[PDB]
Amino acid sequence: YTRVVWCAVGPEEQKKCQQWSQQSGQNVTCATASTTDDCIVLVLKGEADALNLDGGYIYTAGKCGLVPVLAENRKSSKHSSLDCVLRPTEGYLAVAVVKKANEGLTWNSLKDKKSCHTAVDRTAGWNIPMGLIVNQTGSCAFDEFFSQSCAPGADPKSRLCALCAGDDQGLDKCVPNSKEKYYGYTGAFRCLAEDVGDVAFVKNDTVWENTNGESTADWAKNLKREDFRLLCLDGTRKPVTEAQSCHLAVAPNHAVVSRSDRAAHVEQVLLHQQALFGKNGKNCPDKFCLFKSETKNLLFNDNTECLAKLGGRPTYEEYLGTEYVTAIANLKKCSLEACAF
């Protein structure tokens, strides 16, 4: 009845889960997969219960029947009376970041540049940017737009993986999990920070969180916000402070999904779980904090205040919103109902 099997993607997420498992008294157990799609398959088979996913994957998991349970909620200023769990989710800003020193580089001069994406099939890292690009370009050849990139998930032998590093030994090149040096939000930003790429498609919180001595990580402590700029769709360039007036789209928050016949139990165990290891949980700072991993966004983004109820018991198409759902469909015509498994 009351035991949840979380699905960890890769070795770094597995050790944070095992610690979560340790401290839960087996109330939460861990399964491990090499990629997100594999974690979705384990959840379908019934061998795993849930995992926190980006909107890009929610579309996939949704076509295969999985349903959104709880969502991630970060620090907010509007809706200050409401409790984090009952408080609506605001979504997040997908942006195109570049180096200030890289003058002349604008949304219209991206052709043949070098790119950094969080990973294939994700919202801000792939779906939004490329969807805009296919559209504007009137072509599906998105694999020939940038000279080279690091889009975790693409074929290792392709130019879309050309800029990925792999792990400490150089193995697992381009794999879509934390083992890839430039995987995910942080990885992609680093990919720009180290000047490996000309532009990185992440979200706005990513810039703030890793600049101005906010990260302390070898490659980030000396990074200053003013050395970065945002590419707007009007061909303009703006400071990272003008995010609301220069973003590619507003992405729906990452959320925990599960098979519909388990959602009620996955939802209950988690709410309780976060009462213990959440932001102001009984044992978070002292023993274990679910929403902390040191700027590595393991299992959940570090900026999460809490996981929140949904309200309107949404289906995946509703949670993601018709806006974004069409975006993905139009782009997928390039690579129409079914679910890839």
Ligand X SMILES: *[C@@H]1O[C@H](CO)[C@@H](O[C@@H]2O[C@H](CO)[C@@H](O[C@H]3O[C@H](CO)[C@@H](O[C@@H]4O[C@H](CO)[C@@H](O)[C@H](O)[C@@H]4O)[C@H](O)[C@@H]3O)[C@H](O)[C@H]2NC(C)=O)[C@H](O)[C@H]1NC(C)=O
Ligand Y SMILES: *[C@@H]1O[C@H](CO)[C@@H](O[C@@H]2O[C@H](CO)[C@@H](O)[C@H](O)[C@H]2NC(C)=O)[C@H](O)[C@H]1NC(C)=O
Ligand Z SMILES: *[C@@H]1O[C@H](CO)[C@@H](O[C@@H]2O[C@H](CO)[C@@H](O[C@@H]3O[C@H](CO)[C@@H](O[C@H]4O[C@H](CO)[C@@H](O)[C@H](O)[C@@H]4O)[C@H](O)[C@@H]3O)[C@H](O)[C@H]2NC(C)=O)[C@H](O)[C@H]1NC(C)=O
Residue numbers in the known binding site are 54, 92, 118, 122, 124-125, 185, 254
HEC per residue, 153-182: CCCCCCCCCCCCCCCCCCCCCCCCCCCCCC
Could you say which of 11, 15, 19, 27 contacts ligand Y (CB under 6 A)?
A: 27
The rounded distance, in Å, linking the Cα atoms of 53 and 55 is: 6
- Which range binds ligand FRU by CB under 6 A, 83-91, 218-226, 289-297, 329-337? 83-91
The binder of 54, among Fe ion, ligand FRU, Zn ion, none, by C-beta within 5 to 8 A per type, is Fe ion
Our CB check for ligand FRU shows the closer of 247 and 259 to be 247
The rounded distance, in Å, linking the Cα atoms of 90 and 253 is: 7
Cβ at position 284, least distance to ligand Y in Å: 12
The binder of 326, among ligand Y, ligand FRU, ligand Z, none, by C-beta within 5 to 8 A per type, is ligand Z
The binder of 37, among ligand Z, ligand Y, Fe ion, none, by C-beta within 5 to 8 A per type, is none
Rg (CA), the chain: 19
In sequence order, the β-bridge partners of residue 71 are: 255, 308
When asked if residue 85 is in the footprint of ligand Y (CB under 6 A), the reply is no
278 Cβ contact list (under 8 Å, min separation 6) = 284, 290, 291, 306, 307
- Which range binds ligand X by CB under 6 A, 75-83, 119-127, 248-256, 285-293? 75-83
Q: Are strands 114-117 and 255-258 parallel, antiparallel or unpaired?
A: unpaired
When asked if residue 19 is in the footprint of ligand Y (CB under 6 A), the reply is no
Cβ at position 289, least distance to Fe ion in Å: 21
Could you say which of 1, 25, 286, 335 contacts ligand Y (CB under 6 A)?
A: 25
Could you say which of 42, 85, 243, 284 contacts ligand X (CB under 6 A)?
A: 243
82 Cβ contact list (under 8 Å, min separation 6) = 88
Our CB check for Fe ion shows the closer of 115 and 123 to be 123
Report the binding-site residues for Fe(3+): 54, 92, 185, 254
When asked if residue 333 is in the footprint of ligand Y (CB under 6 A), the reply is no
Q: Which residues bind ligand Z (CB under 6 A)?
A: 131-132, 135, 323, 326-327, 330
The rounded distance, in Å, linking the Cα atoms of 234 and 254 is: 28
Could you say which of 265, 321, 332, 339 contacts ligand FRU (CB under 6 A)?
A: 321
Residue 326: Cβ-neighbour burial (10 angstroms; 0-12, 13-18, 19+)? exposed
Query: What secondary structure does DSSP assign to 190-250, as a single string?
Result: HHHHTTSSSEEEEEHHHHHHHSSSSS--TTTTT--GGGEEEE-TTS-EE-GGGGGGS-SEE
Cβ at position 128, least distance to ligand Z in Å: 6
The rounded distance, in Å, linking the Cα atoms of 238 and 266 is: 42
Q: Which of residues 312-331 bind Zn ion (CB under 5 A)?
A: 318
Buried b (16+ CB within 10 A) or exposed e, 259-283: beebbebbbebbbebbebbbbebee
Instruction: Say how many C-beta atoms besides its own lie within 10 A of residue 185's C-beta.
Output: 27
The rounded distance, in Å, linking the Cα atoms of 35 and 177 is: 6
When asked if residue 297 is in the footprint of ligand X (CB under 6 A), the reply is no
Looking at the chain, the number of H-run helices and the number of E-run strands are 8, 13
Q: Which of residues 235-274 bind ligand Y (CB under 6 A)?
A: 272
Cβ at position 17, least distance to ligand Z in Å: 33
- Which range binds ligand Y by CB under 6 A, 19-27, 101-109, 172-180, 237-245? 19-27
Binding site for ligand X (CB under 6 A): 75-77, 204-205, 208, 214, 243-244
Binding region for ligand FRU (CB under 6 A): 88-89, 91, 250, 252, 320-321
Instruction: Note the residues at the interface with Zn ion (CB under 5 A).
Output: 318
Q: Report the interface residues with ligand Y, using CB under 6 A.
A: 2, 24-25, 27, 272, 276
